[PDB]
Amino acid sequence: ALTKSQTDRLEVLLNPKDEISLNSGKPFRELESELLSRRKKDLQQIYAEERENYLGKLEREITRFFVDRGFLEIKSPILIPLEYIERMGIDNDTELSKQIFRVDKNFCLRPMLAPNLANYLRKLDRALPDPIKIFEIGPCYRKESDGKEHLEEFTMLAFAQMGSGCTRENLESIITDFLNHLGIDFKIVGDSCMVFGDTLDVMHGDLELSSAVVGPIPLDREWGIDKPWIGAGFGLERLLKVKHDFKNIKRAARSESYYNGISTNLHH
Amino acid sequence: ALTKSQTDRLEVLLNPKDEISLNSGKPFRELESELLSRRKKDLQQIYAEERENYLGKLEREITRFFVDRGFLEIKSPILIPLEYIERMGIDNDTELSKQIFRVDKNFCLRPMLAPNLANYLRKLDRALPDPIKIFEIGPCYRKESDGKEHLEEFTMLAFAQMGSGCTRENLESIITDFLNHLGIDFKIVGDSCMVFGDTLDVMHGDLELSSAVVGPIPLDREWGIDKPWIGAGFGLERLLKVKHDFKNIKRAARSESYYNGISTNLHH
Numbered sequence: 354a355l356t357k358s359q360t361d362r363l364e365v366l367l368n369p370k371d372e373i374s375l376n377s378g379k380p381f382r383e384l385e386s387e388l389l390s391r392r393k394k395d396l397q398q399i400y401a402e403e404r405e406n407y408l409g410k411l412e413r414e415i416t417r418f419f420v421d422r423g424f425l426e427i428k429s430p431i432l433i434p435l436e437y438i439e440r441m442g443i444d445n446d447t448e449l450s451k452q453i454f455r456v457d458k459n460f461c462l463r464p465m466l467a468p469n470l471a472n473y474l475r476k477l478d479r480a481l482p483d484p485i486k487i488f489e490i491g492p493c494y495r496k497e498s499d500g501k502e503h504l505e506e507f508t509m510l511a512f513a514q515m516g517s518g519c520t521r522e523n524l525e526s527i528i529t530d531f532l533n534h535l536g537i538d539f540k541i542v543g544d545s546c547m548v549f550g551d552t553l554d555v556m557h558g559d560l561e562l563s564s565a566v567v568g569p570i571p572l573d574r575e576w577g578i579d580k581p582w583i584g585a586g587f588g589l590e591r592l593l594k595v596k597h598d599f600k601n602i603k604r605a606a607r608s609e610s611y612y613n614g615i616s617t618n619l620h621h
Numbered sequence: 622a623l624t625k626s627q628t629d630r631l632e633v634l635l636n637p638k639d640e641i642s643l644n645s646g647k648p649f650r651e652l653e654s655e656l657l658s659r660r661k662k663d664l665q666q667i668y669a670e671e672r673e674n675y676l677g678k679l680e681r682e683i684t685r686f687f688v689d690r691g692f693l694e695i696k697s698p699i700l701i702p703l704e705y706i707e708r709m710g711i712d713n714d715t716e717l718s719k720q721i722f723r724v725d726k727n728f729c730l731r732p733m734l735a736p737n738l739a740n741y742l743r744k745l746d747r748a749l750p751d752p753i754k755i756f757e758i759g760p761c762y763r764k765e766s767d768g769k770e771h772l773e774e775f776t777m778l779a780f781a782q783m784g785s786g787c788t789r790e791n792l793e794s795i796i797t798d799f800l801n802h803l804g805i806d807f808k809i810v811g812d813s814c815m816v817f818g819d820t821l822d823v824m825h826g827d828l829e830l831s832s833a834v835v836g837p838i839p840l841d842r843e844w845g846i847d848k849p850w851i852g853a854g855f856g857l858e859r860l861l862k863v864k865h866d867f868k869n870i871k872r873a874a875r876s877e878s879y880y881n882g883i884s885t886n887l888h889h
């Protein structure tokens with residue numbers, strides 16, 4: 354019989370590979386010591402043989418994927434004008450506007466990559482040939498209720514193509530090649546969101562891995578875009594959660610409490 | 622005779638490779654058109670042959686360097702408790718405390734990597750053998766007066782070693798191998814800052830590339846560290862500025878106005 358505090362403690366030390374039961378007869382200290390030893394050996398092995406962080410490693414693999422397929426790598430500001438949020442159609446008093454991390458009077462931490470990538474599409478239209486293909490990977494921020502699938506600080510991949518080839522079939526083809534490369538099974542379901550209209554949601558079971566959009570849409574005019582486009586946004590921590598079978602997305606996050614899904618709190 | 626507005630416009634279109642003079646007899650529109658054509662061909666070439674962003678590429682090269690030399694790659698939160706800033710000795714009413722980007726009541730955008738890496742050193746001490754070596758690359762935030770060497774949103778590399786081998790000689794040796802790898806000449810000068818005490822500042826001419834610290838220092842006790850350590854922090858945008866000979870650090874920043882030092886504003 355373990356307390357909730359004892360059960361929580363063993364939960365954070367448990368890893369998906371473990372075949373260890375908390376409802377066995379073994380006392381708490383005996384269970385904690387064995388798990389502590391396992392998590393120490395896991396960090397030791399990483400320290401000796403790999404030393405790469407899962408979230409950084411995935412970013413590098415995704416970067417290579419899209420660069421090799423003709424997409425320009427973008428690194429745009431994380432801190433952006435609050436006015437970009439308005440021009441996306443996210444008015445005040447809308448439920449999405451209350452997820453915005455505001456900074457000073459006129460800036461915020463970006464909740465999405467779309468505004469910056471939209472400016473890059475319009476600007477790069479003066480220089481690059483058809484089609485224009487870009488992508489960015491970086492931090493995004495949303496105030497969220499507590500949940501095993503949501504983080505307030507997460508990492509988004511967003512890619513976009515503008516010009517020729519911007520069909521639903523091509524968008525699904527890119528998504529399929531991308532998730533085939535990561536080795537992640539998925540299905541596509543139609544849904545609607547209140548920024549882009551109807552989207553294609555990329556589902557792993559009931560977990561949304563991505564929302565993809567087939568342009569053009571009326572919002573394009575507010576950004577100086579008048580060509581067809583296709584795009585999608587993926588959550589890297591959600592990709593890692595599925596890939597490594599984490600029960601809670603905190604295991605995949607920028608964190609001081611977990612490293613590659615291994616608890617960093619290895620005290621007794 | 623060009624106006625200040627005309628001169629500013631040609632300045633942003635000029636690249637360090639260009640051998641073009643603004644005080645020649647050529648009219649403004651003729652100068653702008655030639656530079657616009659050059660910057661279009663530069664983006665075209667990147668789009669066709671490389672497609673990597675300088676800031677992301679440098680991050681990948683630095684990551685590989687430190688991983689190959691036994692340092693564990695860390696990805697920690699960018700949004701951190703305001704209380705971490707206090708425990709670094711940055712009290713209110715101190716000049717450094719007015720550079721902090723505050724978020725909500727109790728959080729801020731990290732102005733440095735030291736607090737998070739200090740927690741990782743203490744936690745990893747329970748698991749990893751001697752010496753413990755870690756590093757992180759990621760965004761940091763400081764309110765700054767306008768200047769050609771400062772950004773409000775920049776990218777910091779910080780590495781640390783804890784345990785044996787934590788001498789000034791070894792710290793300088795790592796710095797030398799690191800900047801030799803990037804191909805950057807530098808000198809080391811003694812200076813003092815009001816968080817760590819005396820530091821070793823890594824200078825490229827008059828531009829500070831890094832501040833390095835030989836522990837132990839009295840601040841260590843506030844973080845649960847009681848072993849010797851050595852560490853340094855580098856600005857990636859400053860490394861790129863020196864490497865590519867940018868006159869203004871805006872050329873090396875996360876930006877919607879420059880890509881790999883090339884203006885994205887290619888209108889007339």
Ligand SMILES: Nc1ncnc2c1ncn2[C@@H]1O[C@H](COP(=O)(O)OP(=O)(O)NP(=O)(O)O)[C@@H](O)[C@H]1O
Pocket residue numbers: 465495497502503504505507508509546561562563564586587588589590591
């Ligand atoms: N708070 C979050 N934490 C982690 N990943 C997130 C978060 N919000 C969005 N993402 C990811 O980013 C992708 C694109 O953003 P978006 O489509 O706006 O999110 P979303 O539809 O609100 N997902 P959800 O909040 O679960 O209904 C999503 O499909 C997720 O994979």
Ligand SMILES: Nc1ncnc2c1ncn2[C@@H]1O[C@H](COP(=O)(O)OP(=O)(O)NP(=O)(O)O)[C@@H](O)[C@H]1O
Pocket residue numbers: 733763765770771772773775776777814829830831832854855856857858859
């Ligand atoms: N505002 C900034 N913009 C760009 N790089 C910066 C900025 N602040 C610090 N850095 C870089 O981060 C390194 C480590 O941080 P730190 O030593 O605290 O900066 P610093 O001593 O205040 N440099 P400086 O403001 O020029 O006197 C510096 O050596 C710089 O290379």
Ligand SMILES: [Cl-]
Pocket residue numbers: 465466467511586
């Ligand atoms: Cl997005």
Ligand SMILES: [Cl-]
Pocket residue numbers: 733734735779854
């Ligand atoms: Cl630092």
Ligand SMILES: [Mg+2]
Pocket residue numbers: none
């Ligand atoms: Mg949501």
Ligand SMILES: [Mg+2]
Pocket residue numbers: 546554561563564
């Ligand atoms: Mg969605």
Ligand SMILES: [Mg+2]
Pocket residue numbers: none
């Ligand atoms: Mg300073």
Ligand SMILES: [Mg+2]
Pocket residue numbers: 814822829831832
């Ligand atoms: Mg300094």
